Homo-oligomer: A and B are copies of this chain.
Amino acid sequence: MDFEDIYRFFQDPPPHYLSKELAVCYVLAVLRHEDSYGTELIQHLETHWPNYRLSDTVLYTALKFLEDEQIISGYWKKVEGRGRPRRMYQLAQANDDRSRDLAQLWERYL
Contact = CB atoms under 8 A, between A and B. Distances in A.
Interface of A: 1, 3, 5-10, 13, 19-22, 24-25, 61, 65, 69, 98, 102, 105, 108-109
18 contacts: A1-B20, A1-B21, A1-B24, A1-B61, A1-B65, A3-B98, A5-B21, A6-B21, A6-B24, A6-B25, A6-B102, A6-B105, A9-B19, A9-B21, A10-B21, A10-B25, A10-B108, A10-B109
Nearest to A109: B10
A6 B64 CA distance: 15
Number of copies: 2
A93 to B, nearest CB: 16
Contacts of A20: 1
A8 B21 CA distance: 9
A5 B19 CA distance: 11
Contacts of A24: 1, 6
